[PDB]
Amino acid sequence: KDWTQYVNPLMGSQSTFELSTGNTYPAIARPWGMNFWTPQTGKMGDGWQYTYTANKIRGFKQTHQPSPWINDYGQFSIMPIVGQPVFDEEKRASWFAHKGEVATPYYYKVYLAEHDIVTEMTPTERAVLFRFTFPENDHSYVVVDAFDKGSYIKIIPEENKIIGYTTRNSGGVPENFKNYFIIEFDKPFTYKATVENGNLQENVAEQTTDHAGAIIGFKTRKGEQVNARIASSFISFEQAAANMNELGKDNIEQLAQKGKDAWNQVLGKIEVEGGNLDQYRTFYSCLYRSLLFPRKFYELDANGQPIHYSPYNGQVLPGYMFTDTGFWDTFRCLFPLLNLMYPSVNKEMQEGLINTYLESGFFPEWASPGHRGCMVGNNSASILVDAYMKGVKVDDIKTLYEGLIHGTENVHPEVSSTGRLGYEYYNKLGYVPYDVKINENAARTLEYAYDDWCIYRLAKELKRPKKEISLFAKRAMNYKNLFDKESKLMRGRNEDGTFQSPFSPLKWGDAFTEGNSWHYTWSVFHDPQGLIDLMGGKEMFVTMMDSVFAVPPIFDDSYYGQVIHEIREMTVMNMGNYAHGNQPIQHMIYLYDYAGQPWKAQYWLRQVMDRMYTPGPDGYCGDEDNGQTSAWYVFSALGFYPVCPGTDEYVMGTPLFKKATLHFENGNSLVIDAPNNSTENFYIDSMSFNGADHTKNYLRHEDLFKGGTIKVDMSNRPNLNRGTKEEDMPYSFSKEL
């Protein structure tokens, strides 16, 4: 059975600075691959390295880039050409068309119209095989570009080989950072030249300069194929050479089949039926996007043991390491998806985080490849605790716990999003103030409270001393400190204790991150009942929620000085202020379940699934964010969502397919049957779980892991009685206390 046929790596490529439809590039790679490969249409340095509307390809590039904002590192490219040997990135570029392009996760092909050359590529985890099909020509070449900001290249003719290293990065690297690469051709060089600051030097073997490059060449007959075996390493040339062996002796067809098998192995863990082709394509493209980041950042030594270059301290050390993810995005449902369907993989990732802490002094928040300043919160605590509570346990729980405590009272001296910016005010006053020069203060406060609840959960589980447990139980309630009774919204609060004025609910940024108060007010994952109480009860709560959808999308952008794409994305979708591409609001619709109106969530979730995701190049409604926006769809299409990682609960939505089957790593399977599902029947009239009536608005992780059958009776009218009782409600902290 093949699922790769539904994956579109182009989904999200039709994006611009002004309006994101995903901001993705076609990642031709193995799952979680250390090195990704992509056609490059953008100029060197530009975060928009591949765009759907672009006319020309200027290289095939090794990339590690998680997003256009964060940008890239460990990057170099290769380009076949004919005619004059040219290195210039504009001069070597070739028109192409998407009808002359085939992109799959395991295999990429394109016809380059200006050189009359076909390029195919098939990667493994750290290596890749290229096959160039040349026209008849006395002057055919391959350009190797090591990129600028300091690089190295050397041609070795007696091995049909080029080696080099690239260093161009976007920050977050140690001073000795280098990516070492090796390229082996199956055809002898009849022409050879290295390049130095734009200058072509024939028969000069080596360059160590700002922007190194090489061009090798030969005569070709019509349709003649030249294969190039490539691998790189963050450790050394010798390790790069060892990484090369992932290719074995395979040709393009054999490596493509191995990558296809590898993708079907992970995609096939979730089988959906009874939908249309749009839905299959959206679902598996999203699942594909959910299995890329964080990437592996470790390599295998001669004994088959994991070692890694440390992007934190620049040493080479034993053990796992992963990178290129921002937890501010991915704590929400991406990592939870790993804990449900790919726990053995997240196990390696958690071990990697322990090593991050040991190597750097801090758990990461945004890492790429080392600590990077972007976004807010201490949501690493959610990642670590959710894994642990779900049976994904690192060996070194002492270091895990100490690292968490450390993160609650330090901030990284160079990277203000690593650790807790404002921890002194927060620990003392119960919030980060609005007038002490700490931007996004309300967003930090809300996420810290949830983060502190996660720590509370683990402290309690570990039976820490009662006063530790009590400290975090108290801090978990810190969200109350920003609640403004008058507006029923979260509000920036001055150091003296007065709420800030004038208060502007529609103002983006400033007190909040990537949105306004209407977006952030719902960020109380661990205590929705507490928020409902704050608002004066479930009826007023629902009224506030309903108004999010019903109001105009007016906004105040003074904080940014322009209509940033996130604001524009909200305005065009016609869902009031519900900006689905904004991460803070992505769990919000599920909160209708905690107020006793799950039918409202059923309505709105199907609206989002039907309207905010399409399978084309412009497929997302905003940034894909390293699996978060994709895993949202994967979960939601199945019919449930981890509103609160750190609990064992998935809050019920409404399934998209007639049947979904989950194959867990433990050998059990869960079948979700919704035979009467359709475009019109999106309400849950009733539900059963292994024969037992199920009226609760949540499923438990442990129950799912035992496997069996859920039966969902779909209907075109809401059931106003189902899931309204107190015993039907998912977890809230104030109910436990």
Ligand X SMILES: CO[C@H]1O[C@H](CO)[C@@H](O)[C@H](O)[C@@H]1S[C@H]1O[C@H](CO)[C@@H](O)[C@H](O)[C@@H]1O
Annotated binding-site residue numbers for Ca(2+):
329, 514, 581-583, 625
Q: By CB under 6 A, is residue 623 in contact with ligand X? A: yes
Please choose, out of 27-35, 63-71, 217-225, 440-448, the segment that lies near ligand X by the rule CB under 6 A.
63-71
Nearest-approach distance from CB 556 to ligand X, in angstroms: 15
Q: Helix, strand, or coil here: 540?
A: helix
Size of the site for ligand X (CB under 6 A): 14
Q: CA 642: distance to chain centroid?
A: 16
Which is closer to ligand X, CB of 375 or CB of 454? Answer: 375
Q: Is 70 in the site for ligand X (CB under 6 A)?
A: yes
Q: Which of 386, 451, 625, 648 touches ligand X (CB under 6 A)?
A: 625
Task: Provide the minimum distance between the beta carbon of 622 and ligand X in the complex, in angstroms, as a whole number.
Answer: 7
Residue 267's Cα: distance from chain center in Å? Answer: 16
Are 145 and 90 within 8 A, CB to CB?
no
* Cβ at position 330, least distance to ligand X in Å: 9
User: Shortest Cβ distance from residue 92 to ligand X (Å)?
Assistant: 30
The residues pairing with 650 across neighbouring beta strands, listed in sequence order, are 699
Among 19, 317, 564, 671, binds ligand X (CB under 6 A): 564
Q: Which amino acid is at 280?
A: Y
Q: Pick the closest to residue 425 from 441, 403, 446, 404 (CA basis).
A: 441
Contact call for residue 374 and ligand X (CB under 6 A): yes
Of 72 and 649, nearer to ligand X (C-beta) is 72
Taking each helix axis from N to C end, the angle separating 277-289 and 628-638, rounded to the nearest 10 degrees, works out to 130
Q: Which is nearer to ligand X, 527 or 569 (CB)?
A: 569
Residues annotated within a binding site: 329, 514, 581-583, 625
Tell me if 365 contacts ligand X by CB under 6 A: no
- CA 347 to the chain's CA centroid: 17
Contact by Cβ (8 Å): 573, 246 = no
Rounded Cα gap, residues 186 and 220, in angstroms: 13
| Residues in region 678-697 near ligand X by CB under 6 A | none
Residues 104-163 binding ligand X (CB under 6 A) are none
Cβ atoms of residues 230 and 127 within 8 Å = yes
Binding ligand X by CB under 6 A: which of 117, 121, 375, 489?
Answer: 375
Name which of 70 and 270 has its Cβ closer to ligand X: 70
- In degrees rounded to 5, what are phi and psi of residue 26? -75, 100
Q: Is 333 in the site for ligand X (CB under 6 A)?
A: no
Q: Which two tokens stand for residue 545?
A: 């929620």
Q: Which residues contact 82 (CB under 8 A, 6 or more apart)?
A: 115, 116, 117, 134, 135, 137, 139, 140, 141
Stretch that binds ligand X, among 187-195, 489-497, 561-569, 606-614 (CB under 6 A): 561-569
| Binding range to ligand X, per CB under 6 A, among 34-42, 543-551, 562-570, 670-678 | 562-570
- 559 binds ligand X per the rule CB under 6 A: no
Q: Which amino acid is at 323?
A: T
Can residue 583 be called a binding residue for ligand X (CB under 6 A)? yes
Q: How far is CA 482 from CA 160, 434, 497, 730, in A?
A: 66, 10, 10, 24
How near is the Cβ of 139 to ligand X at its closest, in Å? 42
- Is 627 or 645 the residue whose CB approaches ligand X more closely? 627
Q: Which residues pair with 80 in a beta bridge?
A: 142
Q: Which of 48, 52, 69, 549 binds ligand X (CB under 6 A)?
A: 69
Closer residue to ligand X in complex, CB, 23/734: 23
Quote the CA–CA distance of 266 and 260 in Å, as a whole number.
Answer: 10
Please report whether residue 324 would count as binding ligand X according to CB under 6 A: no
Give whichever of 22 and 352 is closer to ligand X, judged by the CB atom.
22
Residue 326 binds ligand X (CB under 6 A): yes
Told to check if 516 binds ligand X by CB under 6 A, we report no
> Six-digit token pair at 495?
């150091």
Say whether residue 67 binds ligand X (CB under 6 A): yes
C-alpha 384/C-alpha 393 separation (Å) is 9
Rg (alpha carbons) of the chain, rounded to whole number: 26
Task: Tell whether residue 49 is a contact of ligand X (CB under 6 A).
Answer: no
Residues 246-275 that bind ligand X (CB under 6 A): none
Residues present in the chain in total: 737
Q: Is residue 566 part of the contact set for ligand X (CB under 6 A)? A: yes
Window of 25-33, 307-315, 325-333, 355-363 that interacts with ligand X by CB under 6 A: 325-333
Q: Does 184 bind ligand X (CB under 6 A)?
A: no
Element (H, E) at 207: strand 206-209
Separation between Cα atoms, residue 368 and residue 321, nearest integer Å: 12
SS3 for 156-210 is: EHHHCEEEEEECCCCCCCCCCCCEEEEEEECCCCCEEEEEECCEEEECCCEEEEC
Regarding 329 and contact with ligand X (CB under 6 A), the answer is: yes
Q: How far is residue 718's CA from residue 703's CA, in Å, rounded to a whole number?
A: 27
Position 569 contacts ligand X (CB under 6 A): no
48 sits near ligand X (criterion: CB under 6 A): no
Q: Rounded distance, CA 716 to CA 677, Å?
A: 9
Instruction: Point out which residues bind ligand X (CB under 6 A).
Output: 67, 69-70, 326, 328-329, 374-375, 564-566, 583, 623, 625
